[PDB]
Amino acid sequence: MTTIAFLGLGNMGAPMSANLVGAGHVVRGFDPAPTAASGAAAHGVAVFRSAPEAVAEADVVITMLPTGEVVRRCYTDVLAAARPATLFIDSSTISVTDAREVHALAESHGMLQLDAPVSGGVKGAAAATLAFMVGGDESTLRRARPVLEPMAGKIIHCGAAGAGQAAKVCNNMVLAVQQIAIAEAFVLAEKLGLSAQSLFDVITGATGNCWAVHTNCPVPGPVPTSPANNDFKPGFSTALMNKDLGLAMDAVAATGATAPLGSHAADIYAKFAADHADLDFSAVIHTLRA
Amino acid sequence: TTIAFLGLGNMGAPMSANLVGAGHVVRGFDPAPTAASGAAAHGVAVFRSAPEAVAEADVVITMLPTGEVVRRCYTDVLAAARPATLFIDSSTISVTDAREVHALAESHGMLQLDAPVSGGVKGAAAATLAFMVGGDESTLRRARPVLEPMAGKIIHCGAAGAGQAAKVCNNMVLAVQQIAIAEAFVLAEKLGLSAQSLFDVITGATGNCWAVHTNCPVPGPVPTSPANNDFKPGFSTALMNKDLGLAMDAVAATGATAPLGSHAADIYAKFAADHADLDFSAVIHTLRAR
Numbered sequence: 001m002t003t004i005a006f007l008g009l010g011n012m013g014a015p016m017s018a019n020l021v022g023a024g025h026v027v028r029g030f031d032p033a034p035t036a037a038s039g040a041a042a043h044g045v046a047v048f049r050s051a052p053e054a055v056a057e058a059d060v061v062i063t064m065l066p067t068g069e070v071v072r073r074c075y076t077d078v079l080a081a082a083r084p085a086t087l088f089i090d091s092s093t094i095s096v097t098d099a100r101e102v103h104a105l106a107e108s109h110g111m112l113q114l115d116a117p118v119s120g121g122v123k124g125a126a127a128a129t130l131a132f133m134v135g136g137d138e139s140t141l142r143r144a145r146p147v148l149e150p151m152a153g154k155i156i157h158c159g160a161a162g163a164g165q166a167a168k169v170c171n172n173m174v175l176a177v178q179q180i181a182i183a184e185a186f187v188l189a190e191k192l193g194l195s196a197q198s199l200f201d202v203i204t205g206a207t208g209n210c211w212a213v214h215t216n217c218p219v220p221g222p223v224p225t226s227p228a229n230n231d232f233k234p235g236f237s238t239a240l241m242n243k244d245l246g247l248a249m250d251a252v253a254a255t256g257a258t259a260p261l262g263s264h265a266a267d268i269y270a271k272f273a274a275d276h277a278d279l280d281f282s283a284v285i286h287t288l289r290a
Numbered sequence: 291t292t293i294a295f296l297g298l299g300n301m302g303a304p305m306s307a308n309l310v311g312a313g314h315v316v317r318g319f320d321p322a323p324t325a326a327s328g329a330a331a332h333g334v335a336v337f338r339s340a341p342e343a344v345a346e347a348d349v350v351i352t353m354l355p356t357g358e359v360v361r362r363c364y365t366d367v368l369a370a371a372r373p374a375t376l377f378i379d380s381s382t383i384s385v386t387d388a389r390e391v392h393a394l395a396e397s398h399g400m401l402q403l404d405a406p407v408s409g410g411v412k413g414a415a416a417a418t419l420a421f422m423v424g425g426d427e428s429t430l431r432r433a434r435p436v437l438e439p440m441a442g443k444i445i446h447c448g449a450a451g452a453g454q455a456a457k458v459c460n461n462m463v464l465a466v467q468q469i470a471i472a473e474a475f476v477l478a479e480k481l482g483l484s485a486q487s488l489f490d491v492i493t494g495a496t497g498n499c500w501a502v503h504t505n506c507p508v509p510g511p512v513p514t515s516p517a518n519n520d521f522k523p524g525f526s527t528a529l530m531n532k533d534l535g536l537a538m539d540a541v542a543a544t545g546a547t548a549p550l551g552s553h554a555a556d557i558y559a560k561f562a563a564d565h566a567d568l569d570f571s572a573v574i575h576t577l578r579a580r
């Protein structure tokens with residue numbers, strides 16, 4: 001039983017903090033959108049007036065925030081307020097550069113810090129099946145585990161500070177490329193007169209099989225639970241995939257790496273996000289149809 | 291059952307050896323003496339022309355390098371075949387050529403399937419090929435006892451051409467995936483994320499696919515993958531390049547919109563200019579050419 005400050009109580013942070021309450025933790029919350037704060041207080045978070053007040057009496061500080069800028073700004077307002085050797089876990093999805101900068105900022109103020117961004121969306125969050133991908137010290141993760149466990153389906157240590165954000169962004173670049181290529185295959189099949197069910201049966205039984213087809217199949221019929229059967233409601237929105245791909249391109253730009261298909265997938269999703277940010281990212285298949 | 295096997299190359303030779311092994315009478319033809327001689331050593335009665343091999347056959351199998359050679363074999367032999375002979379083309383060719391050749395054969399009173407294969411020389415020899423079949427269900431049924439001793443799997447894909455359609459769509463996706471995975475590994479490495487960490491995360495996440503879980507293009511995480519054995523095929527860049535050319539023909543023929551499949555095709559066509567003899571996963575070392 002730890003005291004946790006939870007900064008960022010939106011779509012992810014609210015269900016996450018609820019599970020912590022449910023696990024017996026004292027959760028001290030802050031979010032500058034009062035709608036969000038009020039939702040979390042209803043599920044037992046003690047909501048404070050300021051981020052610094054929230055963090056004053058915590059052993060652990062979790063951030064779940066929209067950008068690296070907002071994380072950097074929040075760290076700057078609060079690190080001085082926390083007690084020395086408080087454990088900070090950033091579970092926001094931000095750039096690897098941002099994660100390292102802020103990790104170093106936290107350690108220079110005498111705080112332990114991890115990056116622990118998550119996959120699973122709001123449904124994962126509410127059911128406590130998120131995957132945590134963690135960057136930082138092994139001993140710091142050991143200390144953190146009892147806090148992460150009531151939120152998690154899995155916790156995987158990825159390496160030194162930043163490696164959590166790196167792992168997630170690498171996977172999600174791959175995912176985006178696969179989701180587009182699967183959409184291309186299904187449209188080409190349709191013009192070839194190969195049925196959707198037949199193509200599904202072959203790819204899922206062969207070397208091309210991947211989550212984008214077996215779970216996220218972009219045509220209705222073969223996988224009744226996929227977004228294609230529910231008007232492409234997310235699921236995993238185009239808005240969010242476009243964010244992760246911007247972060248992948250930041251990583252590419254920062255390393256000098258070459259990622260021809262990842263970058264092509266970034267452009268394609270950037271264009272599609274302008275008008276269909278609201279649709280599951282499998283809905284990119286519409287751009288391939290005339 | 292008497293079988294005429296036309297094309298006794300690297301795939302054709304072992305396939306026909308399995309047919310001999312299963313108790314069929316195999317009649318053969320190949321324009322290379324070395325191929326014919328090899329085939330004759332495992333029990334194929336080799337003839338000097340293809341119309342001759344076909345004369346006594348209940349089933350005629352082609353394993354030939356292009357649609358044009360397939361079409362030409364068909365017009366050289368159809369008149370020499372008995373009525374209701376079952377023709378099976380297991381060559382990899384365009385869907386258009388497959389359909390034309392199918393129509394040609396059934397106008398001569400023949401029964402015809404397209405049944406291209408995955409698994410390579412090693413699958414051919416071990417009798418584990420995956421046949422993806424286009425044509426009538428009743429014709430596949432009749433063909434089943436012939437295909438079974440060459441095969442690990444048999445999938446009915448739809449009407450004539452659907453087998454070529456299914457294989458070419460799966461192979462276009464695979465090539466994209468192989469490149470995307472290489473990009474992720476190279477990116478991870480420049481981010482200071484280890485190969486093994488990325489491997490652990492992707493294989494347990496949504497990015498997982500054969501191109502990583504079995505064909506991992508960095509040495510270590512999958513000791514049997516071609517990356518640990520000097521990129522010895524495996525599945526050669528030459529043969530991936532071949533299937534992608536057929537994918538691009540199918541895209542041109544239909545007016546399809548396949549950006550990432552076409553980009554992959556460009557990437558491998560260029561790579562095949564230098565490294566046609568390496569496993570296609572070797573693409574990881576040509577990304578800086580781009």
Ligand SMILES: C[C@@H](CCC(=O)O)C(=O)O
Pocket residue numbers: 128129148149150151152153154155
């Ligand atoms: C993910 C964690 C279990 C926590 C949970 O099931 O909520 C673990 O197995 O490491």
Ligand SMILES: C[C@@H](CCC(=O)O)C(=O)O
Pocket residue numbers: 417437438439440441442443444
């Ligand atoms: C399992 C396989 C049986 C043929 C064989 O004997 O290998 C098939 O269904 O094609």
